[PDB]
């Protein structure tokens, strides 16, 4: 197909990537292979935007995304950590207005020595990505 493909996904991150980013809410054919151990997802007639690939950085850091306009590669890339992460993350501060309210989550992103810092748009608290990501 003439679309986009994601190679070298850490095992058990394939199903999550399909889930968190609503990749199965399209009409195209999707090929998915879990545990080769490397997960991989592929979508026909689907091209990913610039920052759209960036958002995978936190979950599949060392992973490759290849573009297909022919039966061969038209452009290969790796995800780079973005300035902001919207929609998919949940704020650990339980007093955050974000919860129960009809707004999308948003965190500023900031690399550190050991952790990645995620500062909430709303409650303005900064957390280590390990705390934010623990569901």
């Amino acid at each position: 197909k003439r679309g986009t493909v994601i190679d070298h996904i850490p095992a058990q991150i394939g199903f999550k990537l399909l889930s968190l980013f609503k990749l199965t809410e399209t009409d195209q054919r999707i090929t998915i292979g879990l545990n080769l151990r490397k997960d991989l997802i592929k979508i026909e007639n689907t091209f990913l935007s610039e920052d759209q690939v960036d958002q995978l950085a936190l979950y599949a850091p060392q992973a490759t995304v290849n573009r297909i306009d022919n039966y061969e590669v038209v452009g290969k890339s790796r995800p780079s950590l973005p300035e902001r992460i919207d929609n998919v993350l949940v704020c650990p501060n339980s007093n955050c207005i974000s919860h129960a309210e009809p707004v999308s989550s948003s965190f500023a992103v900031r690399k550190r020595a050991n952790d990645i810092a995620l500062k909430c748009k709303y409650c303005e608290k900064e957390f280590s990505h390990n705390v934010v990501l623990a569901n």
Partner: protein
Amino acid sequence: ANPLYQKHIISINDLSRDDLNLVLATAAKLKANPQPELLKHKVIASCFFEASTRTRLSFETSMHRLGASVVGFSDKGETLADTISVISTYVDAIVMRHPQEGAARLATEFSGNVPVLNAGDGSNQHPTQTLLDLFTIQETQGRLDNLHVAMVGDLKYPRTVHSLTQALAKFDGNRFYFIAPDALAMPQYILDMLDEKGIAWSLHSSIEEVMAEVDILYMTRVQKERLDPSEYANVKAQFVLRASDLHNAKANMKVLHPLPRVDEIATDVDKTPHAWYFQQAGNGIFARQALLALVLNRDLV
């Protein structure tokens, strides 16, 4: 023989090593041999100046398990001394919980010959909690000596965890691991107490550092209400315990919590053989039958 008959049970810092041993032994014996009419015709006052229905149910069950009668209440311009002076005329023992520190001690000065039992006096003492803890550690481990004991969570504020450290330092060769965030550390007075007895203690940041060694994983209830919601998000993330954390655990190791355990021990643990916090609460009935019977009889059995 029974040096606790007609004594008040107020503070763990007043129970001697021998007194501790006496209660534990009486508890084990009462657990194994029911004595359901030992305290027939006694009336006991269940005085919860501060509500706490888990504690109250546990005590009152102890009371009927020895066939006593119970009267009481669960929630004032008149002094506490006046209240106790009246209630002593009515009853044969006063079990009492109070928001203010020193309330049980003060009750003893106006209860006359009637023994006062402390169900918790504000920030100070909670003897029965430490007693049923010890009875559970001892019953599961076979001993109270030369144990590896981790205490994880909030160690600055829980009175019962200071209590339990003091009482375990009355036994020897114990190794203590204090796993808690800086703002909720074990207080200085406790560490100094341990140093003056040449008792072993180390700090750590995560239960994984030491899980391989521990015989007792003692989880406290973090008092979130004192903290910023953000700060607590980071604490709960670090220190919550789930079953995945128990790969190194010794087969004899037990997880203990004074309860309620909502934000500290995931329900994964419940199904593992290391889960002993409900057995721990159940054991409270015998530590409390023990205390009641010892203070209301001079004769054993």
